[PDB]
């Protein structure tokens, strides 16, 4: 992993001295050299995974040797799991309010049911007459939910299909929008992305998102190697951070998702704001991946 | 005998079917403590039986045999009801079972 | 000068002929005397700005902005670029293109990153190409145009690798639904240009239809969107006027006091959040009395709201000149004015409540309420009405406490039900203080129990 | 109701009177746990009651209310029997009382 | 007490040097001087008490300053309680198988019942096919039982009256003679005194017995100042030692007690051995005392 | 010389006349030439040997042993003796009386402690005295006499304070039921003496009846017990003879092996435990082979039991001379002899037990026992019979363990009930070892299950 990959060379005078050099940033000349020397280190071009032990340090260590952009790199992405992501699609192929059945499947699973209840009881907690919940603690609650609950319950519930609006709202209600997603204001998506960029886990999992969810044209489904789950996994990873996406409405099948933001006040940057926001709502990858998965593909 | 031992049981029941006033179509694994007590009646219980049957003790709300009752419940279960709201319920599903 | 966009692209292939013109990079003027001096960066970059190799393949015509392969880009060169791509599949590479010598961050308007895509194969047969790839760029074009800028040529529709490698295929272009707009493309033309300087009075965005014919004939059209930027010369403002009228009530404290909001809008810094956030101004002086101690001006939300969180002071009237400009003292200003006209009932009325001996109380014996007109005077911050007595020998003590709620309520515990008949007429007195002053001096309440 | 609360009662009873086969005329302070349970039925028990009344549960040794049972006994009591021999008896007098 | 009484002067060079001198025992000249000097120390003519903290040290320290036999000193005896012991008779005066009623009184007393069980459950414990009990642990349990249980249960049960042999046997069985009193052999009483004489607690309580239970002739009841209680206390203190007395038989009223020993092989000391036994069996004090106490005196 | 007893007594009173003869202290001879030289200790002692005061009141006639008050013992003297009595009531004081100059421990036969009692009052009126207190000592007399000692006067009955203070009251003494005994008291005599040397062939104790008449006449009598001691000249021993016969079986180990007990009794050191405990002897050599390694002699209980706790050795026969004397090599000895004649069946018999398929076992399937004549050969210390097999494919393993009990039992677990029909004839082999040698070499057991 990235943490050990640093330790493999951190004892060396080369990595030790040049690591500190980049931390400083003439210095720019030495920092450029520090990149080239560290470029050969096991840390450089390392990879982490969602739910990793010390998932934060595996990125703080790696990012600390970045020399210093709209689409960031995805070193956090468990690249090798991309195959497993395909396998998960094979699983859901085998295994009416369908989101309810997904919820019932969780309720019968001692681990999922316990984790699911253990985090809903946080996100539904009333704080004051004019404060529905502690959204930060809810985000932390959900952030653990989507790593500790098995994929065959996490993704089945998150990307469940529906036949009516009662189910479709249940789908929207999966992570309590009234706590985790909705708020009094919708900040500018560009500023919101800028805030997310400063957090290692949010920024990197955001990188994971468009790493697998970018509205690509070369592939058939706009997903890498037409991989539905690769996007869906990286997408789910974003839930529990400032950029938490959610379903827009309760359409029985018209599945549209986006974070809790808009593009008001972008002006000269309206294109860049939409350029990223479109990846949530106008993205055939998420559209096909969520529907195909929910339909058993 | 054919009676089963005292232990944990289970039945999948919808929240609304439990009759708790919560209009929800989610199911929970409703576990409960039931069955024949393997432990012999305590010497206390034997005295209670003999002293009760012979009307030596005050007539009172007594129990002359170990009760196959739970000793612990599951932490909680949460659900989404018909009103697009979530609720958690504690002490609903047995976690430990023993005769007292 | 500024580039027509911040990023370009074109399809590259294995072992393409040396010299293959790839594309044009364009830049428009701010002043007619401005002429670009195009140049490139010394290295080709790959996935997530991976520095792959010294740019020994792609060169640029400093005058026209024409990008071409000065050397044939073979398979081995691709493999060399691939292994240096930090493990990513090498699908797109790019280079930096600048307007003048600097070397510096490729930050548009002063730069553009030309993102060339690549396929692990030779150029496809021209006869297999569709009008879409023969006419228009791989991905949808996006243009960037500024206001109060001279017009000029900003793009050429015809793809150079098609003219270079497929000159046998005839392609010609034009615009549809462009009438009345500054954008023109002559019938059966290869180029597109503007005719008049853009301003905000015309549009905040363009989306035209670009169409071509190939050859047998096939017609294809694509959207022609253009990003419009905001003129930066002055702050056109404001449609709203000034209204200094307001009022403040003494001893009416709030957690968040507001005097007035004059909503504002301008064509300069409101369109984009950054334009105001990067630089903004507000009232400077007077400060000491009001602006330093209590009240502030919320200009950044385009509200011009004056509000306060701290405590109030004596009725000192004032009228402060609010600044709404972007840059104060170095540019033309836009200002408004707001005044504060600071002006507490303190009712002393003993409510003579009636009680009963042997009250059938659930837990406590309710006497009555202390809610008076002050409830709005102090705006819910209760002045702590306290009811006390020392004369009567009945109902010695209860729960007659200085409730903090707006209304306030007084009662005693259901513990004296058989002591109230000791005496019929019970005499109480109520006082209340707040804000370091006596609000309710005293009132003597006559409360009976029989 | 007139029902007394769940708690410990006592009655002085001879050893042989307990019917344990110990031929001794000594008496012991036979304490026992009895009375109405203050604790309300849990949502566990409320569900069980509804699932029991409607015959949703397997017919089994179940309890639809907390049992007023002891939670602890005296260590032991010794006595001298009719044969000039000593014996100790465990768990014959409740030391703690609670509803489970 | 004796422990502190030594400490009060042990810091002095006089007591310190002369204390060690007596431990050595020319030496006899200095040891004789040590006795005369230490004679003035607070330790001299000190006393200990039943149930005193450090019941051993309060005697070992006192005896250590004796320069170096039927009647030995009783420094352990709670001398000041002698007056109270007389008054205790008035309390005892205030408070059918009589021994059973005594047992029932204990069975209803949570403290007595528990302590009573705490030693019977030990004294009736089988060790091996040819070992009825661990008599030492039994004696330990009995030794604590008769010091921690209130007197109105210890004496009421131990010294109850009877009307028949069924009660009288209950009386004799109070301390499970089959464990605490009886054994395969009856050693020579005098040799047992020689053994007991070496233990500070046993020897002192043995002296206590021959201080208050000597078959005296000057008084009416052969008890000091005709004080029934004086003997009752010292006698009961003997339970749990090599000289543990017990009832001889199950006579309904013919109460006779003695330790578990005889005078075989005494030779030159035959009478002296008997003289020690007479205080148990031929002593009007114990006879009148136990019978009187059984009748509520 | 030795005193007639180790402790004397008489009643003292307040302000008694100086010179009042109190009592006699007597001592008898071991040789006729011995004459005592009586003396006293320099201090009077009180409760628990409390040293009260320099003996300035009581003196002794060195020839007759007469104790008298050389000075009048007044009240103040009593109070001085009282306050020095360590808080005890001063009821009895005593002084040491010795046979010769030494000063030394008052240890009889070489000393006696004369315990004088005291009343806080003057001497009572003679007319109020009863014959009991006029004739005989306060407490019952006890005498001490030794064997093979010359006779002589050992006591005078008449109480000296009665003759001194009550000479008007006539008292005379005699013995009853003394005929045939060495004790005599002439009719109407004041003294008592022996006539012949005592020995053990006469008595081990005396209890005569002493009687007096006073004046009007009253007769009173008291017991006259005398403690007899044992002659110390040699050991009359033994009524038991010697029997060297015995037998030991090889490989018959016990935790406590016994060869023989020859119970002994003598008139010298058996009467008292101390006589033998203080000094005793037993077999000295041979030692190395048997007496040093295994066996010892129990002479102190008067059993002469030879026994062993350790391991046995090869059949080495011997006959050791046991010593039963008190003091060996300085006095006449008494000895006996015991021999040891040391001489294990080791049966090899395969018991062919019958089993059944589908045995209705409760928990385990019992096969049989390994009990044998060897059970008495090794006296309950089992040689660890182990039954094993490797040929049969049925009943692979069980609980066929080397039971430590005398008999030994073998069985298997009820786990192969449906495997036993696999084969009818199961072949087992049993071996056993102990004492660092092979006891049961091997036997092959044929056990069937069908």
Swiss-Prot record, chains A, E:
Keywords: Cell membrane, Disulfide bond, Glycoprotein, GPI-anchor, Lipoprotein, Membrane, Receptor, Signal. The keyword Glycoprotein applies. It is a lipid-anchor; GPI-anchor. One of its GO terms (biological process) is nervous system development. Interacts with NRTN ligand and RET: forms a 2:2:2 ternary complex composed of NRTN ligand, GFRA2 and RET receptor. Also forms a 4:4:4 tetrameric complex composed of 4 copies of NRTN ligand, GFRA2 and RET receptor, which prevents endocytosis of RET. Interacts with SORL1. It is found in: Cell membrane. One of its GO terms (cellular component) is external side of plasma membrane. This is GDNF family receptor alpha-2. The chain holds residues 39 to 359 of 464 of the full protein. Receptor for neurturin (NRTN), a growth factor that supports the survival of sympathetic neurons. NRTN-binding leads to autophosphorylation and activation of the RET receptor. Also able to mediate GDNF signaling through the RET tyrosine kinase receptor. Belongs to the GDNFR family. The gene is GFRA2. It comes from Homo sapiens (Human). Disulfide bonds join 2-46, 48-58, 99-160, 106-112, 123-138, 133-179, 162-167, 189-261, 196-202, 213-231, 223-285. It comes from the Eukaryota. Glycans are attached at residues 14, 295. GO terms for molecular function: glial cell-derived neurotrophic factor receptor activity; heparan sulfate binding.
Curated annotation (Swiss-Prot), chains B, D:
GO terms for biological process: cell surface receptor protein tyrosine kinase signaling pathway; cell surface receptor signaling pathway via STAT; glial cell-derived neurotrophic factor receptor signaling pathway; MAPK cascade; nerve development; nervous system development; neural crest cell migration; neuron projection development. Heparan sulfate group binds at residues 52, 61, 63, 65. Disulfide bonds join 6-68, 33-97, 37-99. GO terms for cellular component: extracellular region; extracellular space. Transmembrane segments: none annotated. Keywords: Disease variant, Disulfide bond, Growth factor, Hirschsprung disease, Secreted, Signal. GO terms for molecular function: glial cell-derived neurotrophic factor receptor binding; growth factor activity; heparan sulfate binding; receptor tyrosine kinase binding; signaling receptor binding. It is found in: Secreted. Belongs to the TGF-beta family. GDNF subfamily. Homodimer; disulfide-linked. Interacts with GFRA2 coreceptor and RET: forms a 2:2:2 ternary complex composed of NRTN ligand, GFRA2 and RET receptor. Also forms a 4:4:4 tetrameric complex composed of 4 copies of NRTN ligand, GFRA2 and RET receptor, which prevents endocytosis of RET. Growth factor that supports the survival of sympathetic neurons in culture. May regulate the development and maintenance of the CNS. Involved in the development of the neural crest. Might control the size of non-neuronal cell population such as haemopoietic cells. Acts by binding to its coreceptor, GFRA2, leading to autophosphorylation and activation of the RET receptor. Heparan sulfate-binding is required for signaling. This is Neurturin. It comes from Homo sapiens. The gene is NRTN. The chain holds residues 98 to 197 of 197 of the full protein.
UniProtKB/Swiss-Prot annotation, chains C, F:
Ca(2+) 2 binds at residues 201, 230-231, 233, 268. Residues 137-238 form the Cadherin domain. Changing residue 57 to A: Defects in maturation and processing. Changing residue 114 to G: In HSCR1; also in a colorectal cancer sample; somatic mutation. Ca(2+) 1 binds at residues 147-148, 199, 201. This is Extracellular cell-membrane anchored RET cadherin 120 kDa fragment. Changing residue 325 to K: In HSCR1; uncertain significance. Changing residue 86 to C: In HSCR1; uncertain significance. Ca(2+) 4 binds at residue 233. Ca(2+) 3 binds at residues 232, 234, 266, 268. The gene is RET. Changing residue 166 to Y: In HSCR1; sporadic form. Glycans are attached at residues 70, 120, 168, 302, 309, 327, 333, 343, 393, 413. Residues 1-450 are extracellular. Coiled coil: none annotated. Residues 231-343 are annotated as: Cadherin-like region 3 (CLD3). It comes from Homo sapiens (Human). Changing residue 420 to Q: In HSCR1; sporadic form. Disulfide bonds join 106-111, 126-166, 135-212, 371-375, 394-423. Residues 350-450 are annotated as: Cadherin-like region 4 (CLD4). Changing residue 8 to S: Defects in maturation and processing. Residues 1-122 are annotated as: Cadherin-like region 1 (CLD1).
């Amino acid at each position: 992993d990235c943490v050990r990959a640093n330790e493999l060379c951190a004892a060396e005078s080369n990595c030790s001295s040049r690591y500190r050099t980049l931390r400083q940033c003439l210095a720019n000349k030495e920092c450029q050299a520090a990149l080239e020397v560290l470029q050969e280190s096991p840390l450089y071009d390392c990879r982490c995974k969602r739910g990793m032990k010390k998932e934060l340090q595996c990125l703080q260590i790696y990012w600390s040797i970045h020399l210093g952009e709209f689409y960031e790199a995805s070193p956090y992405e468990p690249v090798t799991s991309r195959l497993s992501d395909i396998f998960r699609l094979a699983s859901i192929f085998s295994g009416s309010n369908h989101c309810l059945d997904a919820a019932k499947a969780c309720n019968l699973n001692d681990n999922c049911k316990k984790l699911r209840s253990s985090y809903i009881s946080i996100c539904n907690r009333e704080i004051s007459p004019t404060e529905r919940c502690n959204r930060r603690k809810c985000h932390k609650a959900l952030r653990q939910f989507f790593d500790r609950v098995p994929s065959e319950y996490t993704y089945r519930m998150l990307f469940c299909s529906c036949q009516d609006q009662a189910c479709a709202e249940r789908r929207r209600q999966t992570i309590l929008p009234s706590c985790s997603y909705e708020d009094k204001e919708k900040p500018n998506c560009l500023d919101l992305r800028g805030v997310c960029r400063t957090d290692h886990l949010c920024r990197s999992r955001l990188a994971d998102f468009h790493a697998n969810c970018r509205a690509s044209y070369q592939t058939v489904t706009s997903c890498p190697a037409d991989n539905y789950q690769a996007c869906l996994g990286s997408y789910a990873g974003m839930i529990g951070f400032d950029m938490t996406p959610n379903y827009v409405d309760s359409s029985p099948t018209g599945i549209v998702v986006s974070p809790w933001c808009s593009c008001r006040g972008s002006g000269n940057m309206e294109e860049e704001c939409e350029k990223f926001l479109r990846d949530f709502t106008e993205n055939p990858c998420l559209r096909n991946a969520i529907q195909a998965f929910g339909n058993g593909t | 005998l054919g009676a089963r031992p005292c232990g944990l049981r289970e039945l999948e029941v919808r929240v609304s079917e439990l009759g708790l006033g919560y209009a929800s179509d989610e199911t929970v694994l409703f576990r409960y403590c039931a069955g024949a007590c393997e432990a012999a009646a305590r010497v206390y219980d034997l005295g209670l039986r003999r002293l009760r049957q012979r009307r030596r003790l005050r007539r009172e709300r007594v129990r002359a045999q170990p009760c196959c009752r739970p000793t612990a419940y599951e932490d909680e279960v949460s659900f989404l009801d018909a009103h697009s709201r979530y609720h958690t319920v504690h002490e609903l599903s047995a976690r430990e079972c023993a005769c007292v | 000068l500024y580039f027509s966009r911040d990023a370009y692209w074109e399809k590259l292939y294995v072992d393409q002929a040396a010299g293959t013109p790839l594309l044009y990079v364009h830049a428009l003027r701010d002043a007619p005397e401005e002429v670009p001096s195009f140049r490139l960066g010394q290295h080709l970059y790959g996935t997530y700005r991976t520095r792959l190799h010294e740019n020994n393949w792609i060169c640029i015509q400093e005058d026209t902005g024409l990008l071409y392969l000065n050397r044939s880009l073979d398979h081995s060169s691709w493999e060399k670029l691939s292994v240096r791509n930090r493990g990513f599949p090498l699908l797109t590479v790019y280079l930096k293109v600048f307007l003048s010598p600097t070397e510096g961050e490729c930050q548009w308007p002063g730069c553009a990153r030309v993102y060339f895509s690549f396929f692990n194969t030779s150029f496809p047969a021209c006869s297999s190409l569709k009008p879409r790839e023969l006419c228009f760029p791989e991905t949808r074009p996006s243009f960037r145009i500024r206001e109060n800028r001279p017009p000029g040529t900003f793009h050429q529709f015809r793809l150079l690798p098609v003219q270079f490698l497929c000159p046998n295929i005839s392609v010609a272009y034009r615009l549809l639904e462009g009438e009345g707009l500054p954008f023109r493309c002559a019938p059966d033309s290869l180029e597109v240009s503007t005719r008049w300087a853009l301003d905000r009075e015309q549009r905040e965005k363009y989306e035209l239809v670009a169409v071509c014919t190939v050859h047998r004939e096939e017609v294809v059209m694509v959207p022609f969107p253009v990003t419009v930027y905001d003129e930066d010369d002055s702050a056109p403002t404001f449609p709203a006027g000034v209204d200094t009228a307001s009022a403040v009530v003494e001893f009416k404290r709030k957690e968040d006091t507001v005097v007035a909001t004059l909503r504002v809008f301008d064509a300069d810094v409101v369109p984009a959040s950054g334009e105001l956030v990067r630089r903004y101004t507000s009232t400077l002086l007077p400060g000491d009395t009001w602006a330093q101690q209590t009240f502030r001006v919320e200009h950044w939300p385009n509200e011009t709201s004056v509000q306060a969180n701290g405590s109030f002071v004596r009725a000192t009237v004032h009228d402060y000149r609010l600044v709404l400009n972007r840059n104060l003292s170095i540019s033309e200003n836009r200002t408004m004015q707001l005044a504060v006209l600071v002006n507490p009932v303190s009712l002393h009325l003993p409510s003579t409540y009636s009680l009963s001996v042997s009250r059938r109380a659930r837990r406590f014996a309710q006497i009555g309420k202390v809610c008076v007109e002050n409830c709005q005077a102090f705006s819910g911050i209760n002045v702590q009405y306290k009811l006390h007595s020392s004369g009567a020998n009945c109902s010695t003590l209860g729960v007659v406490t200085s409730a903090e709620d707006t209304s306030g309520i007084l009662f005693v515990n259901d513990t004296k039900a058989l002591r109230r008949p000791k005496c019929a007429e019970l005499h109480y007195m109520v006082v209340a203080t707040d804000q370091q002053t006596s609000r309710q001096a005293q009132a003597q309440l006559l409360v009976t129990v029989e």
